[PDB]
Amino acid sequence: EDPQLLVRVRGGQLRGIRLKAPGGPVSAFLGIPFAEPPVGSRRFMPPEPKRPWSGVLDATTFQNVCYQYVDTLYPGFEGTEMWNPNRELSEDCLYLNVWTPYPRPASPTPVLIWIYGGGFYSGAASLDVYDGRFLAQVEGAVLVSMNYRVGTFGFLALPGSREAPGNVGLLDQRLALQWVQENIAAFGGDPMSVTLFGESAGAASVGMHILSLPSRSLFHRAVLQSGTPNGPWATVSAGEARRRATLLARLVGCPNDTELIACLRTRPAQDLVDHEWHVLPQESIFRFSFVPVVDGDFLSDTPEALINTGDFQDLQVLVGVVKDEGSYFLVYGVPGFSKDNESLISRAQFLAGVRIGVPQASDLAAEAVVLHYTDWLHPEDPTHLRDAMSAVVGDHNVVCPVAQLAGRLAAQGARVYAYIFEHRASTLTWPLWMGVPHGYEIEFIFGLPLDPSLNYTTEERIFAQRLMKYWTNFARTGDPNDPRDSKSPQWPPYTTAAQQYVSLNLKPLEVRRGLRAQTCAFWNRFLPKLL
Amino acid sequence: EGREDPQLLVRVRGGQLRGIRLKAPGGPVSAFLGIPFAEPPVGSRRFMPPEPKRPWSGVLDATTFQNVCYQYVDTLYPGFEGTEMWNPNRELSEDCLYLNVWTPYPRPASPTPVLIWIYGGGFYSGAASLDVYDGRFLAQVEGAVLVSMNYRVGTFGFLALPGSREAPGNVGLLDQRLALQWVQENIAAFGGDPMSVTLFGESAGAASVGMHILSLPSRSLFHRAVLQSGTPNGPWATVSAGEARRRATLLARLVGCPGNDTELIACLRTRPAQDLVDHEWHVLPQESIFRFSFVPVVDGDFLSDTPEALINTGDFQDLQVLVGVVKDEGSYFLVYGVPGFSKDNESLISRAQFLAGVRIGVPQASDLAAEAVVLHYTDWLHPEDPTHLRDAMSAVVGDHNVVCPVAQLAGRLAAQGARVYAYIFEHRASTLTWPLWMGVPHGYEIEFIFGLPLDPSLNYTTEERIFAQRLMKYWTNFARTGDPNDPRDSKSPQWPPYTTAAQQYVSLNLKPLEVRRGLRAQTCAFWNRFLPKLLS
């Protein structure tokens, strides 16, 4: 037995495992249940807290991944498989993981809680890129990550019903947040200092906790990476959720709400996943079938309405984007694109791609996009068209929602820091034309390059140490800047007037102004006026 | 005759003319000023097409500029050179259809290429006799034969009840056309070559040139064209028949006229010319700048369709054109009608004054289209900055009315067979009396093309005189060959043709020619491709 690996949480005792990080040991408590398995009659239902257990619960391995569609686009390719589930799929999946220093820290340490992305249809806290051992060892952080239900299981809603109220995957996250409030001190974490951080759908989830009062007392700071609660993909109206839910029911042979959900509950999980994709209203990319719903409960209005009127005075937020947010979404649904060629496209392929990238857009709005993004000096150069298609998808779904959120939070009292991440991993297996794709900053924030077996360059290890410091300084103080540093330069807060953000790359911080300011006026101010 | 300079007696189809030896800096030139090319369009000939001048007896004196065509005189700023240099410099009269010819002295040995100038002035003003249009320097230094004509402006030139006998429209363009016919028949008497006639003009002058390009009967009367800071396409140079009818009959109401067309025009014909000018401005459908009340009409005759339709479908295979713009086309139009702007202060304006200005600068625009303009022209990094707003207001007016029309025209002509050369003129005259903020305003390249800086009494710098000599050479090489470049000169950098592929144009300033690509390409996609689709 090892006292440092025995912890008593409120449900009883846990045994963790000493794990090896490059510079020393860390304690890991993996697979801790925070909820009753949401199975059988509990499918689609809010999570209940886990009941207490006897003896010592084994907490030395990651638990099952929440049931989800598995990507078979490019089978065996590292670029796709690194996101695929690395444990058994199961509806019995409400577990969380904790990493701490070894030995467990002496005084209460700031807590980071990670929320994975995956389009609210996939993801797992157990992936290698979300491995908390480096941040625990090097920075002394207590790092927590949870599984939350995705797809139909997490987000299928018949709004107004008792038996499928919507947003239960967000409630899974919220329950893990409560679990941290009540238990994290047993691990040496500080429940008074809890920073949420997430990427993609994880970022939008973080944004949703910011916009939902019952979550607000469970954390103090937030980081949104390449995703937001506002924007075209992260939510749906109640009407639209109802429509998709009842269409999914029809597709699997079902059948009033109670009857309909009862039958959905009799269906094997894989039947639901088999048809999940068929409920989208249009051919589209960067759209997902079952996402958070504007229910009037968890989300009291649309995110757009909530960020416009919210009071964010005592909030600190770090937000940013990568250099090429949209590149990889193209190789899924857009004709002309592939990971295996340079994807040089024609003008026709670009207008066709824009209808798919901006599926809500009328003929006139689609023309406005095309006219804005064309290079009128080289109107038909296939490189510019490819890159423009990528920028359309990235700007519309991520960059301009992020700029919008930053502006509103800062205007209404938040302290905001913003970045753009422009370093492409030397280890990346996606082709060069995709640049720095959606998701490829995470491995740097989590400190993976410090593992010498992963073949990252030396500059990359040092860059990762820099980022871990920004993120943990932010978690500790609300400010990413290193207080033991004059040789700087300083990361300024984002404001609506100056609009300062920084480049995160191998060169030292450069401060820039305006986050695609002209192009975001197009998406955030002009395009909505085209109805 | 018998006692006079024998090098100044010439005969033309209408009769004998006596010209005048004028002094230019480097030598004498011949001038034949005030030659009538039409019957005075007065009395029952008001609003009617011009008839050719009837022959005269004896020797017509051609030593002074004749009357300026009846027009509104600008009195905003009394004493001020910046406005007065464009105002009439001879008596105003409906009897105004005269032209001017300048040639070397002595008159050239072999037939010389002919430039014909067409003045601007919003189709409501202008005169061929202004100092900026003085043909002596091009005649002396480059050996050119230069011809300029007076044509009717305002109501007298463009008031139309389309379909009628008595006010058919476009008669000012017909005056121009008649002077072109007069050059064909007579210019060889002066040593000019009717086989080599280049039209050139600025502002409404340029649009007029473009209208001759687009109208078949004009096409046989010239070989090459220069359009400076103006075009036949675009929002101001024409009106539909319906709209001309509407303005003509509104003007008639306003002067008491008081109901078929003959009756109405007959009563307009009894009105004093100054009554018509006193109400000319009152017929515009909105508060607006860069809009003029009586302009060429799409009649189905002179213009068989809209200029936009004609440049899209035209065959311009054997045509050479030089086109361009000045650095600050719009700046000047702001001091006229936009609240916030003045020649006497820096005109730093607010964001509210900018949206108000945009409604005036783009009067056809819906609420939605006006937001699109404002959003496009806003600097989102400093959206409240009053210097940027001022300059943006100027750019909106300039781009919409001149730069993007010129880009559109250049693109269509080049794509459908023309040889096109394109420029932006960026030198501000050292002698300019408008404020610095206005930059290089609409019209202020003209004095350089005509070579005024060569007159030592006008106080231009030395570099400016050299620059003027350069421009005169580009213009006259273009007139001579269809190519502004010097054939021998290898050291001087070349002006390449504007093409759709490479979109090349040149900077005209004190530094040697720099080649640039894309004429406000991104912003002109907004005005030429997007904005029209905001028709719904």
Ligand SMILES: Nc1ccc2c(c1)c(-c1ccccc1)[n+](CCCCCCc1cnnn1CCNc1c3c(nc4ccccc14)CCCC3)c1cc(N)ccc21
């Ligand atoms: N014939 C069928 C039948 C069923 C489904 C099908 C196709 C497809 C599909 C495959 C190819 C082309 C078009 C569609 N998709 C996928 C739709 C597109 C999903 C977009 C990719 C995405 C978006 N957010 N997470 N992921 C999953 C990939 N994981 C990544 C993630 C991240 N970054 C990256 C970067 C590069 C590559 C992958 C990747 C970052 C955050 C988390 C995950 C599914 C999606 C469903 N929700 C359900 C079923 C199916």
Ligand SMILES: Nc1ccc2c(c1)c(-c1ccccc1)[n+](CCCCCCc1cnnn1CCNc1c3c(nc4ccccc14)CCCC3)c1cc(N)ccc21
């Ligand atoms: N109280 C009254 C009574 C009657 C009229 C009134 C006002 C005004 C007016 C004056 C000041 C402010 C607003 C309106 N305008 C003028 C409307 C706008 C005129 C725009 C100016 C213009 C445009 N094209 N030619 N010009 C005439 C000036 N000549 C120039 C020309 C050029 N460049 C310049 C550059 C700077 C200054 C002048 C100038 C180049 C080409 C030729 C002429 C008139 C116009 C009319 N068509 C009829 C009546 C009146």
Ligand SMILES: *[C@@H]1O[C@H](CO[C@@H]2O[C@@H](C)[C@@H](O)[C@@H](O)[C@@H]2O)[C@@H](O)[C@H](O)[C@H]1NC(C)=O
């Ligand atoms: C600049 O001028 C505009 C117009 O005002 C005119 O000229 C000034 C100097 C005064 O003589 C005034 O009586 C005239 O009407 C103003 O609308 C504008 O506010 C001025 N700009 C500023 C704020 O400097």
Ligand SMILES: *[C@@H]1O[C@H](CO)[C@@H](O)[C@H](O)[C@H]1NC(C)=O
């Ligand atoms: C790349 O390959 C794909 C799939 O085989 C195809 O659809 C596309 O046309 C290709 N593009 C290029 C540049 O060859």
Ligand SMILES: *[C@@H]1O[C@H](CO)[C@@H](O)[C@H](O)[C@H]1NC(C)=O
């Ligand atoms: C320019 O300079 C002359 C000669 O010294 C001076 O007397 C006159 O005032 C100026 N003339 C002009 C054209 O402004």
